[model samples]
Target: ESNIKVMCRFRPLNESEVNRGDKYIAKFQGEDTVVIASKPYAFDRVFQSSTSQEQVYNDAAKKIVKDVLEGYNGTIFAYGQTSSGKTHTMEGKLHDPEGMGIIPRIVQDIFNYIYSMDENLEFHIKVSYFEIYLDKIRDLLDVSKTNLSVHEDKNRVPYVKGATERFVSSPDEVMDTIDEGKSNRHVAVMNEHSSRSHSIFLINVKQENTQTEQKLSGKLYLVDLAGSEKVSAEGAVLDEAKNINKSLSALGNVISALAEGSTYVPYRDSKMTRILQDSLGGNARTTIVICCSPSSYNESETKSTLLFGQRAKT
Candidate 1:
């Protein structure tokens, strides 16, 4: 089986959604299959609107934390149309610990694992935040920072040059780093905070091996991707549509190659594949959260999103 796993999460219909009168075309087939506009696609897991947030993390995503503790890398991504609760699912609710999002819950569990480990084994947690705007890549911790360069080491492992990595000792510090990083995200420049852009949040948890002295690190990549819509003057703006399409094309090609068993999986420098190379490649485990809206009007985008998830399921 492929290391990457794809799952679907459909947002609950609020009052406005229930009365939209358009039609919520997504229907779950058992727990793993979903029928969108009469077409069927199967994913590893499917979450209905009634599904609780706690269930989502515990059933679908929380398993990966075990891999991380044993020094395995994992990448989790939430992708879908805008206003589809991607932000809420990742960031979670502030006051309610029961409804807390994945990232927050992860910090708690990761440290829990670390503290439970042998005293001789020490784990260091370092995190960095960055986002890909149309042509420029800026650090979230410092918006004024220059566009960071993607540098490849001798092993062809790519690293972002000059990206800020804050050493965090606790879950609170991790959230604070995220808060500060998110604060820098604004203005009309970065396409208004991830609606039309793809953002990557990375947490590197690594510890030195007592025998080998090599870094036994687990890297988690949390990526929120842009929506898929037709390119036109009015759709998502002409320039943005072009760049978004370019990035999608690059990402699409890579995903296609992965499914086709082609030896040549071209990792584009401009989009998802490149930004996620470290976690997507190697023996890493990947889980993609295919998010969507329940409003009837979102039929088209919802269908396309599910189709994207279907392609990744293999």
Candidate 2:
């Protein structure tokens, strides 16, 4: 049973928010319910600000990785407004074990699983990285690859054409490959606006039974979607916001369509949704962690983030 798991996470207020008189706007009653603006919102899981990176990974993501190793496609994507800890939750401090996020932890777990598997079993892992900027695809591994297009196999599985894939044998190798891709990400807007583009790190695993000669493969998509907050901008940024909203709005529509069991799901409305089509409703185990800032200043955004999860659960 591959059902979408929608989770809500509230982050503690920061210095700026506190200095500006932002009070806590979210209250957690238990592990699975959070009350915002006095409205009760339920989810597959709810994480309080006090929840650690390891706690979130274990509850929201660890199982997905376990399943991926057994040959099922999986996806873990973080959604939130800027500064809501989406990046922190997904990529935290990679160098510090205590501060490491889901991505790093996942790598560690995958390697651990491999080490404990049957001696005769053989596994091959490959990694690919890309980003969706302005509704266009950019290959992070090879910057020369621009405006890449999506293609699918006979099974109707979607993948980017010409995206570079690196073979990795160890956890550190995987981490280094990701770092290389991050350096190629669109940084002009990030300096002043934070991540304005969506990035997906794909791990492809193929394993064989040495004696039986049987093989199976699976894919794991780790996505850090762009911030969903609405704000005004000018010049180049105006165009950037327009594109960002278009893709995020497309994502919302896709979720609504899936929840309603509509005959037609508009995955082609934007590139992000197109790439995420399989994860949304097909043969993939998916988890969406909606991050929210617990401050009165961001009450509206927090509610909307919660609402997104609620709609997704339906």
Candidate 3:
């Protein structure tokens, strides 16, 4: 069983009710820094609002990243409607100089921490990137195969390919590979360069006792979920939008089932949930970052998002 700790960062919202319902709290230097609750879903809260996306990420990193380095398996995931700062928080805009997302920043911090430790202790790191498309798992690192299967044992859970597992050795290598995958990601007008499918970057680390060579293993999982959207809101065609809606709707069902203590959860309904079985409502050190916008126009969406957060906290 994983010992998970939760923290929340609430985006600025106009309505006071939005702030009242947020469950996660971040305390820095003994002060309550930020609280993330649900609000109407829109892009403006993250991009066009008074608060910067980087600021939100930085606050979360201060609390969450330090925990990961201290030997806890960590998960930082973004959830919200389409175009609601999920990508900005996960990958950031490519090479804009000013745009640096949580994932990249976490990588840099991890490396710095590892290097600062005693020289006698050595660290090994590996990374893997993959996406779930139409109920199938695809390895972003190896573009050759479209269908991939995950392997699960009692003690360990991971995605496997052929005889080898996709892992990386350094933060720079992981960043380089992510850049390559970003170029090949599927994007469209509705979400403008946003990820259409759920993507995960798995970071595995091994720290060895220099004298005895004994090892301790830890993991950091960073996921950028496909933005949840209402089909009509994004102007998707009836047939295609219906498919998209059904998939996301199925995810909602799974979450509800898990929350209600249902014995049989329908994880197989979508590849996203199936691959994330251990992370979502399971025995893992998990932290969810729900991104949202504070706008009157998005009140209904924000309400639903906040409700989801409430249930998740329970």
Top-scoring candidate (TM-score): 2
For candidate 1, give the lDDT: 0.75
- The C-alpha TM-scores of every prediction are 0.89, 0.92, 0.70
List residue ranges in candidate 1 displaced over 4 A: 20-22, 186-194, 209-215, 231-237, 269-271
> lDDT of candidate 3?
0.58
CA lDDT of each candidate?
A: 0.75, 0.83, 0.58
RMSD of each: 2.9, 2.2, 7.3
Please provide, for model 3 over 1-314, each residue's C-alpha lDDT reduced to its tens digit, 9 standing for 90 to 100: 22232333334444464555633222122232222232222211123244454675665554556655655565666677654455666667654435777777777777777878867678877777776665566777777766788776667564455412445556667788787666655455544554566667777777888888777776676776565556554343334445545666776676667656678878777666665675565544555666655544455564555555444443
**In terms of TM-score, how similar is model 1 to the real structure?**
0.89
Rank by lDDT, highest first: 2, 1, 3
Candidate with more favorable, higher TM-score: 1 or 2? 2
Cα distance off (Å), candidate 3, residue 32: 10
